[PDB]
């Protein structure tokens, strides 16, 4: 009675997935699954009053779980994540979120039970196994506070005797700039001899954070940068070579 | 009398394998490996009534399936990521798919129990194993909404007077194109010093989502490009360097 009523029930199953629209065969090889799958587990558990030696079953059940519980390791580690991300979760919908070990840049759109669905930058879906997410660092961007200008000026060797003056002027322009935060770093220095130039860092941040105000505020100094260099009569230097003649 | 059904079963599977049309030789050996995983379960599961000490059965099945089920772990796992697919699969027949991981890029042709079928884009099929669809992120250009158009336009660095007139010419072509989607990101900023010239940044949508009028758009966009940059004077940048000759 108890192999009549699974056999019905999965039975029903069956239909249901068949007027659920699906191909026949499928639906047939799931149904036969489901069958053996319940047999196994119906003679396992009921082998005794008919059954056999309780030595034989104690080995096939160890045998088959264990070749079992190593074949279904990512399956359910991915919905143990998933879990995982409902109580304690990183992020929420609409945050922009990267990794510097994987590829999962984007905005993200679903959190499901298996796999996170996350919008890329070329309007792309991307499904991203949970279990990553228990593995690798996650950055949010879409949290942040500022937006940070990072540059360099690379002046010819011929220019060292205004590398200060020009190292002062920029400093004092990035000071009395409306769209900077002077409550962050902002650090101009000459750091570094090139193979062809003498650099000069830039360091700051913006106050705003939106994508389109940020890179005006970024042309808007790129250009006071060009104009202060060229005004003390320096000039950016291309790569540069010297050349021996026979 | 059970060993002699079992016999005349996998007989008539051996005849049946060989009608279908195979190798003989291999057709013999699967025959006999059947015969001896049987004749062993046998074994283990009724070594009681004429069997054996039941210390000694415990630890050679164990053995046995502990060897047999890390043996087969990939195979098991490649049909129970067949099963998920079946139940919850992010694409469907006919969807480009890809992945930043794994190179699986192409259309999906079949999707199977063990293995998923998908033609190449240069007419090839490539065969998938399941489970790599349960560790890896699959992104689904198929189901794109939009076509980007990003590049670059490298001016000389003796264009610096005229940056910002180009990136506004440029601008007010891009949001008069019939073929550009107005409700999504559109950039044009000058955004970086580069080796030998000065970067501006183009960053649109499209319409379309089909690849070649996405194509010819693009094409017509960088023609006005072209245009617009030369009919103010300046002009695109090739590599450059400053030679000191002896
Ligand atoms: C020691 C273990 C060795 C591996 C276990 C057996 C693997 C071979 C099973 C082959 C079964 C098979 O090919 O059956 C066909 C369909 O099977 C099906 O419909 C799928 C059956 C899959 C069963 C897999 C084992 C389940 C175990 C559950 C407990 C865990 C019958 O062909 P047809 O007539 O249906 O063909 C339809 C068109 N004519
Ligand atoms: C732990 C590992 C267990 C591995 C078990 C592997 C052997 C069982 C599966 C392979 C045989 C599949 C045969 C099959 O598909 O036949 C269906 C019924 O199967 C059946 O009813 C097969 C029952 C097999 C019971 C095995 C009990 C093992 C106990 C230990 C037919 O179904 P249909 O009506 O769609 O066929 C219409 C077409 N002929
Ligand atoms: C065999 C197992 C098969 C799976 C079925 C079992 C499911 C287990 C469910 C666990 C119940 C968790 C209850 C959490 C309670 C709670 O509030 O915890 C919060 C999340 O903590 C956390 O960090 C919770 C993390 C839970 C991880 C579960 C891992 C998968 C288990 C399988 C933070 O704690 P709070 O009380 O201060 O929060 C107050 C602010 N919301
Ligand atoms: C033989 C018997 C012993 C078996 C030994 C282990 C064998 C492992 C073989 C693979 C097992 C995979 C289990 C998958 C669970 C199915 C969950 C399900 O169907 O409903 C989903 C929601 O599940 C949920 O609500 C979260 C379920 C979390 C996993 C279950 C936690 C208890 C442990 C269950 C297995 C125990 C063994 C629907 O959501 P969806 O995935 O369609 O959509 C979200 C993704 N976008
Ligand atoms: C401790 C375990 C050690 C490893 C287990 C034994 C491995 C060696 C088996 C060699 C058998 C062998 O070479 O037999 C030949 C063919 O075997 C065959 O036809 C293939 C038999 C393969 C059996 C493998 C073990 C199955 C275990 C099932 C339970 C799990 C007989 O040669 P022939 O006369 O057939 O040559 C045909 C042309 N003349
Ligand atoms: C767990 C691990 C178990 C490992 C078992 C390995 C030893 C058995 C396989 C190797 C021997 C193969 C011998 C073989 O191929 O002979 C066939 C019959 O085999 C047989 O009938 C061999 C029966 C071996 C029974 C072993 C029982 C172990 C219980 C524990 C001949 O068949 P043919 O008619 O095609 O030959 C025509 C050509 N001579
Ligand atoms: C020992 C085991 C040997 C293998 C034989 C056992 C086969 C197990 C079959 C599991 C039955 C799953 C039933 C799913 C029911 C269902 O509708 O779930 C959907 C898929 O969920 C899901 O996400 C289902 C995921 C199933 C993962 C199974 C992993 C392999 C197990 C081995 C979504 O749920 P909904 O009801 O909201 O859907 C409504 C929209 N269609
Ligand atoms: C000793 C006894 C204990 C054994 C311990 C584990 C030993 C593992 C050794 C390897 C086992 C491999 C099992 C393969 C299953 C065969 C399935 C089969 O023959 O029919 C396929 C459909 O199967 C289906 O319908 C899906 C079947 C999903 C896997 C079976 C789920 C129950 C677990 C069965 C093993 C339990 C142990 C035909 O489809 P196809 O693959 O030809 O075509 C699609 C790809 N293009």
Same mark, same amino acid.
């Given at each position: 009675?108890?192999t009549?009523?699974?056999?019905?029930?999965?039975?029903?199953?069956?239909?249901?997935?068949?007027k659920?629209?699906?191909?026949?065969?499928?639906?047939?090889?799931?149904?036969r699954?489901?069958?053996?799958?319940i047999?196994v587990?119906?003679?396992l558990?009921?082998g005794?009053?008919?059954g056999?030696?309780?030595?034989?079953?104690?080995?096939?059940?160890?045998?088959?779980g264990?070749?079992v519980?190593?074949?279904?390791?990512?399956?359910?580690?991915?919905?143990?994540?998933?879990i995982?991300?409902?109580f304690?979760?990183?992020?929420?919908?609409?945050?922009?979120?990267?990794?510097?070990?994987r590829? +999962?840049?984007?905005? !993200?759109? =679903?959190?499901?039970?298996r796999?996170?669905? #996350?919008?890329?930058?070329?309007?792309?879906?991307? *499904?991203?196994?949970?279990?990553?997410?228990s593995?690798?660092?996650?950055?949010?961007?879409?949290?942040?506070?500022?937006?940070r200008?990072?540059?360099?000026i690379?002046?010819?060797?011929?220019?060292?005797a205004?590398?200060?003056? +020009?190292?002062?002027? !920029?400093r =004092?322009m990035?000071?009395?700039?409306?769209? #900077?935060?002077?409550r962050?770093?902002?650090?101009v *220095?000459?750091?570094?001899?090139?193979d062809?130039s003498?650099?000069?860092?830039?360091?700051?941040?913006?106050k705003?954070?939106?994508?389109?105000?940020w890179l005006a505020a970024?042309?808007?100094?790129?250009?006071?940068?060009?104009? +202060?260099?060229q005004?003390?009569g320096?000039?950016?230097?291309?790569?540069?070579?010297?050349?021996?003649?026979?």
């Amino acid at each position: 009675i108890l192999t009549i009523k699974l056999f019905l029930l999965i039975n029903q199953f069956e239909k249901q997935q068949i007027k659920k629209g699906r191909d026949i065969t499928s639906a047939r090889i799931m149904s036969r699954i489901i069958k053996i799958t319940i047999i196994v587990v119906l003679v396992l558990l009921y082998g005794e009053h008919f059954g056999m030696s309780l030595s034989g079953l104690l080995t096939f059940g160890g045998i088959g779980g264990l070749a079992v519980g190593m074949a279904g390791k990512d399956i359910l580690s991915n919905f143990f994540s998933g879990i995982m991300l409902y109580f304690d979760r990183p992020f929420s919908i609409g945050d922009w979120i990267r990794s510097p070990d994987r590829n +999962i840049e984007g905005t !993200v759109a =679903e959190i499901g039970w298996r796999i996170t669905k #996350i919008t890329t930058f070329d309007n792309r879906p991307l *499904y991203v196994p949970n279990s990553l997410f228990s593995s690798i660092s996650v950055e949010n961007p879409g949290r942040m506070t500022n937006r940070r200008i990072t540059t360099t000026i690379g002046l010819r060797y011929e220019d060292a005797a205004k590398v200060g003056v +020009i190292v002062e002027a !920029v400093r =004092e322009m990035l000071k009395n700039h409306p769209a #900077i935060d002077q409550r962050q770093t902002l650090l101009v *220095y000459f750091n570094q001899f090139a193979d062809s130039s003498l650099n000069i860092m830039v360091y700051c941040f913006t106050k705003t954070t939106v994508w389109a105000e940020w890179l005006a505020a970024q042309q808007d100094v790129y250009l006071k940068i060009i104009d +202060i260099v060229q005004s003390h009569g320096a000039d950016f230097a291309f790569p540069s070579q010297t050349l021996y003649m026979d």
